[PDB]
Design a protein around this nucleic acid. Sequence first.
DNA 1: AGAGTATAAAGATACTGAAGCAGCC
DNA 2: GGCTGCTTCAGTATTTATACTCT
Lengths: 137, 251, 287, 1316
Amino acid sequence: YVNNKELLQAIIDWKTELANVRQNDTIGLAIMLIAEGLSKRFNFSGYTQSWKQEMIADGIEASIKGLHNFDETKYKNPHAYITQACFNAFVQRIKKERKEVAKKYSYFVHNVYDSRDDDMVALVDETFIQDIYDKMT
Amino acid sequence: VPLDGGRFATSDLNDLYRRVINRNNRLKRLLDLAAPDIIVRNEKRMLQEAVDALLDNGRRGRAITGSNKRPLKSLADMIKGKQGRFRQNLLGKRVDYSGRSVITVGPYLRLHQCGLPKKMALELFKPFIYGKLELRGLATTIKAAKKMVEREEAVVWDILDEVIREHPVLLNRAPTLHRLGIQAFEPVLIEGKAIQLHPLVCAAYNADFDGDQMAVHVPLTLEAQLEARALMMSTNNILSPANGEPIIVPS
Amino acid sequence: IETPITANFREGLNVLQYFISTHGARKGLADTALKTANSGYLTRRLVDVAQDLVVTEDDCGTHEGIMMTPVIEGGDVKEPLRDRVLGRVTAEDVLKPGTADILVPRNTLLHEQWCDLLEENSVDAVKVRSVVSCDTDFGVCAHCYGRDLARGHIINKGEAIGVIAAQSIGEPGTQLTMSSIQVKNKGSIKLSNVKSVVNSSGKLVITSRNTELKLIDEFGRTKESYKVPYGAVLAKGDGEQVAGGETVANWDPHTMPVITEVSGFVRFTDMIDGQTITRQTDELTGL
Amino acid sequence: VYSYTEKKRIRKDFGKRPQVLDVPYLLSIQLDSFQKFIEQDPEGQYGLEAAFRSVFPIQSYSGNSELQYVSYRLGEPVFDVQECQIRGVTYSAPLRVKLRLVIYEREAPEGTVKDIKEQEVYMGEIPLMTDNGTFVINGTERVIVSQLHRSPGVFFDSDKGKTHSSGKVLYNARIIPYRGSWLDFEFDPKDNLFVRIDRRRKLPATIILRALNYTTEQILDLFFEKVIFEIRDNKLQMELVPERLRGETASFDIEANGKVYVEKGRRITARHIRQLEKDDVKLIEVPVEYIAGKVVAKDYIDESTGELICAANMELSLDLLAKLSQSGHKRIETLFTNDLDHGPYISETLRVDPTNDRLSALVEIYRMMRPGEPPTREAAESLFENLFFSEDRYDLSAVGRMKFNRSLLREEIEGSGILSKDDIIDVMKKLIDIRNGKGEVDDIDHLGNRRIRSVGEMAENQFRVGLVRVERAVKERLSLGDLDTLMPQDMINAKPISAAVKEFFGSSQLSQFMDQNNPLSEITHKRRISALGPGGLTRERAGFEVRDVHPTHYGRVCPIETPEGPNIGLINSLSVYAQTNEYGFLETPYRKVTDGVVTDEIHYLSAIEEGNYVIAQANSNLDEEGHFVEDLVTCRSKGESSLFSRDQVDYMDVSTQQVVSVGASLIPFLEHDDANRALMGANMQRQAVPTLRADKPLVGTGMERAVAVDSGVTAVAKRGGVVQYVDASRIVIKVNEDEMYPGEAGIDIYNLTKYTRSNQNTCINQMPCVSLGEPVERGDVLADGPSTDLGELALGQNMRVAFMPWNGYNFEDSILVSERVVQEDRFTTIHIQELACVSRDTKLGPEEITADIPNVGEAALSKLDESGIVYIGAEVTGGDILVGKVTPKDSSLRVPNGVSGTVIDVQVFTRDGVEKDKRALEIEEMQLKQAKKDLSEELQILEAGLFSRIRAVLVAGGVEAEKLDKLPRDRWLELGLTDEEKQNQLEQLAEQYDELKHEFEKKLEAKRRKITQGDDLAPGVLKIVKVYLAVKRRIQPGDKMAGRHGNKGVISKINPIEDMPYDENGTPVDIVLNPLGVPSRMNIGQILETHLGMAAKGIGDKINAMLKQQQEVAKLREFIQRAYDLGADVRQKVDLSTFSDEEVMRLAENLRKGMPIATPVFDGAKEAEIKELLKLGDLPTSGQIRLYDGRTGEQFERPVTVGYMYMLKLNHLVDDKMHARSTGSYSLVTQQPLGGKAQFGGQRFGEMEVWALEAYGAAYTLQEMLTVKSDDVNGRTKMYKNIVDGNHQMEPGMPESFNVLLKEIRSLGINIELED
DNA sequence: AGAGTATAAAGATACTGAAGCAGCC
DNA sequence: GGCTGCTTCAGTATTTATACTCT
Ligand SMILES: [Mg+2]
Ligand SMILES: [Zn+2]
């Protein structure tokens, strides 16, 4: 990946500038690289490209917002810092999406008022099972 | 969720819309963060890509799939294909007052009549029956008439074989190749669940009797009855409009 | 395959023959499936392109049309004139083969009576009206069309002929699939687009490419037609009767006869080896 | 000798050829697959061991911390099959894997393990296969259809025809791994050479060539040969062997040794080549013009300047030659070239090669794979390296290695799973040699290039995927060493493995409900070879060339049995004798034809071993000695068929039926029939619905045993013995002695299955075919499933039928049926719709099952009991309450509209920990009463031996036989017995007794546990109630019927009995077919069969008369003997002389309604023997008799044909079709009436119907058929009102789907509107 | 609803058409 | 510089594994 040393210099420079407002684009590219890299982890990169892009954009916005608070005199590795930020934003996004899906289910399983007879069992007593499965939270 | 019984659908447009707004919102907030313009650029790129995939997916390089790897249906794909509004709901739509059955011969029929099982005929002409009942006064409310019809009392059958008297039906087969795949008739009631069909007309329909099926429609207004009686009757179409050769050849 | 199936459905086909027949049958079935498939699309395109022609006149007011004439593939006739014009309004009055003796007026609908009438009188070709040359804006006139073909009378004003045409052409679709002149008949000969010369062997060789023979009967209606290429030696001249079995002309198809049509001389001029021609001793005769 | 279940009814068997190989077990595919998927085996091989040893062992990120595999085991199903079938759980088993993690000494690979830690882990829960090759997923019964795909390896495709339309052919080569990525070489109209990976954009082949660290000189050294020019006195005489000059022109003076051989302008002849070669010329003068177009292989370097006097792959010249000879360079290397023997195709690619060094090639590859990311050395390096040489992301299974090393004509069949440079090189060399003309392309549909998967292989692959994910996870968690608290359990997870296995089995394209309405539909749904699914073709995508029969299908796939329709030839069904080779290629038996004999030492042959020899055909005569009686034998050698000598032959087929499948090996007189109609015949024969009573097939193929036995609907004896207690719903057999081991005294207790809803709503219920007190042996049939009879198969009823027109009531294909068929009720069937209701739990509290539901009159409630459940046996019509259910504010399970029936069973399940009802207690307690019974019986039969020993010891010691029978038999120790060893024996046997009592208490208490317990349910369900309605629908005008020979028809009129054509003897016929159906649809069989049928029935009425009025047994013996000999030299040879004078009466009692006749397919019965049998009766040999009318009684002239044909009934029952609609449920998006019969859906008024209704001047009906009757909302309400009010009139309006279209376009940026 | 967060380098359709694009006389 | 042969692309026939701490 991108070097760990140059990021130190770039962030020190931007922090000194903050003591006078915008980040150098080098550190922005570095953040994008590390976010998109973590996107290819094994626990992620497993389900769908419709969510994954939203997770990555969210994590990038989160890390950019949060780089405001990086201690420069101690903890000289920001690799783990940005990793943790994007990780947290990832998991928040995954929660929101899963609960929106559960909303769809829970609206479904509460509608036995239709036309007429012979309603199913599997196709209806399976959405319930997913409708409860994430409700363990 | 559309909720047309049974399986539940998704109405996937929602999904797409959300993402757009999502990214749009995100963009605005970066305009309150003054990010590296590389990231603002990447976000603008994502926004363009999302609006595109919403308007007409697949036109850009890769189409996005929700699950089962089946590319989700963008907005435009509600108009293209065999399944847009055009080839699915504006030209050919499903219709009320209609039925379907298997067909049989009845070589005792004349040429301008066909069999029509009592059950089906009772189901199709229902509002006519309610009208005649509430005319004769054999009931007061609509539900009275419905229960009466439901108990199949001995009075409904005379009402039925009265209304049928000159009320033509339109019979049709599945692949309607040429003009003679849909023809009018005057039905006679039958004790069964199958449609009788005059053995001479099974050439226009190209209908064997290996278990073919047919559909029955019912004209309503005066004009439709007059047209079915004067134009599409089985005793007006004996000359194939392709070439004036007769089409009622005993087979 | 070389060996055929020397049994039948009253004896018993043994194994191999049953195998081979099976091959053929499955091929047929797959053909049927895909044939319905293609024909559906074809008839869809058909009904779409026309889709809008409505008979909106009664007479476009014109005197044009096609010279309807019985088709002949060269030997047997493929269709008598009676059908091609059966129920179709003629353009101009038709003359008996007694020229200046009309047989039917100019603007009459030809039902069976006039069909037989022209049939016996040995009429050959008729300028009949048509739809291709009709003179209507947004539609076609009734007369240009002809007869309804579902009712024995002229087509009424308003019928959607385009759709019925589309369906009629498309429906049978699923039924589809996926030398010399040895005249046999007796009649007069006619030539067409002739340039020729009498040979040094008594016969007349024709030396054009628009050439064509039209064998009429004794009456005046053409019954046969045949193509003769550049330089074919006719056995007989024009106007002479002919019997069945004997040829009337034969050429060499395995070369291109390029005889000149004058008297004079020739040379080996502009024919120089190395740059233009080659020395060649004939490997079969030697000259 | 015959099985004792066969001496009840023998079948007269024609056919003269003695068979030598009994048909093999018809389900060996599924069983023999799922055997090699769960079996502990050494040397890796197949099974799980392969998946484990291919992922494990794994180690940490150099933390000296390993996680290795030890062993595995499958514990046990917690439930037997039927309980899974009932409750709704997956008959499965748990996978306990013994694992071990080891962490070595830190900074010491050679060092000791710092700590080992072993364990056994629960991972996943895998389903299991019954003894009938099926799975039970959620109550239901699934099956996994096999698959037919393209073998792994290399294929040299031609791609002839439409390439460039110029006419020139191409060639290309695909290398296909089992897993990994394909690689494609292909030529060019410009005769170049290109490569592409994963069907992507094109590239030059030299790219791949260099990226293996190949220099241009090495390339040119590999591919082309050499020609050397060496400095001479003059002209640079070239060393030469004349072989490269055969037929080449003399570009100079072909002269040497002071003598000329060939003059310039004259091409060197092959005889001149021989002259040169015998002369042995080596050097020749060559003009310096002839060496103008030669290209140099290896670059040359000067000596003094030390420069590039010439490079590699350079076009030679004059000055270049002079400079080369100038620098002292004697030798000059160029390539030998031609145009028909050694085509120069590499050099041109090197010239168009935009690459020179390996690094730029890797960059090119990376860019062609990954766009957007600019080059990066090690990135592209690792990409290319692991793309084709990673043990992980690319593999050829051993079959791939076999096909590879065989296509290249190498011999070693064992290689790596990764590629190798030399191998790609040899691929390219072979492709080139094809381009020259040495070698030919491979044909695709060939059956040496396709192979069948199974359930074992697919399951194993899904298991590998699960293991891969879990391995990534567990490797991750191994970078977080917290030792002495991480046992090898919390490191490992099992959820993804289980999710993958359950997702495969429970959902796929190759996992279908068992087609279960026939003892044949099953056994044909398991021998189905589908060519679809994952890694296969597609309906609208496959081509006309795979869908046809290849001359290599002879004995491996049935040619006549496929489903007609949008997918023919894709789902062909396997043959009868078709095994599967070691690698998945089908094979077939054949018989070794040695020098002059046809022995019986048989061999199995694949599609490639066969295509070398000459195999005779099945029906080829030979005289009891092996030698063919003929001298010219028909044979098929290599996709051909021709006569052959008596000594060329090598193999000969086994039996005449090994060409057809089993789903069509049943149709008799097949060889007398068409092909289309036999196809339709088989595809209908797999649809017969089981009728009320079953009856043997009067004329059959002799292959009706092995279809009933080998399927599972029957009930077969495990081991022999003597029947002891039969009963309408259970059988109990006392086992024999030697068939009984020392323990387990043993009585087999077959609990027959009663009315149970099959997968298509058709009852099945076995019934006993024995009676109290008769011997059985191992394998004899005891009960008969649906559509079986005395052990044979029976799909329909055989009727008396006459071939003649009848007033047109059988006009096109309709059928006319009497009323001795609707009365005898021999075509009635039973249907079992299942309904279920569940007690969920939403907000405001859950719902309940109280018998008190709101705002409904008592009239409805009358049928309900206290719990809220209708009684067993009640009769219910449409729209009735079966279970009460109230929602937190009614949700009572009604009867689905339309269906009727009589409740026959109710089930109730409750989440253990919910207040129970009464009905549950009732069903539980009855289940206890039934469950104690078998154990009680085994108890009381076992107690006998102990007390027998008691009597044996009590006889010595003053036996008193008159008291031991007074007080109960438990008092057999208290009598006078002296204090001897015998009293200790009495105490010991008493303790044995009490021990057995303890054992049986334990067993019955375990059963009580399994029953009185609750059960795991869907969390959120309180109780689940299930109802089992049932109907009996008989026959009517509209149903479908069909013979076995593709003659189907809709029964049209039901005929009074006194109107049917009766013969001179009062006996009316049942069915009146149509003769016109035969001569075009050339199915002669259905008629020819009809003759034999009558003949058979003729021998029935010859016994029935002989037997109804009494008659001694010797006469029946003699007559049946006569009837059983009756033929040419046939194989049957049964003699009643050996029978025991009593069972003969039973045989006659079975025959008394017809003597069943066998007919092997291509060994059938000729006409002569049919007529001989007809004469053994008394009927006319013509087979036609005179009939009379029933309406007039006046004879029919022209004697007609009557006989007995085996008619079926196909389950397109008309009441399932008939459907109408007045007004129902519309949709919301577009308010068009819904579609289908399940919903109250209208009819589809498509395009074509609009065109046709438009061709007429029909302008109003078309209007109302798409505005009022479908969509215009206001319009259709006003229509309903005006129809009720006696006013036929409409107000059109404007449709709704149109406005949907507007708002949908206008939702794009397209302003679409309407003007004034 | 928000906000601080510090190991990790992680694939077999087939056919038809029209503009684009390198090249040539 | 215009003209021309490849070349590439567009068109048609149910169900997704895991914070933390405030505040
Ligand atoms: Mg049919
Ligand atoms: Zn006109």
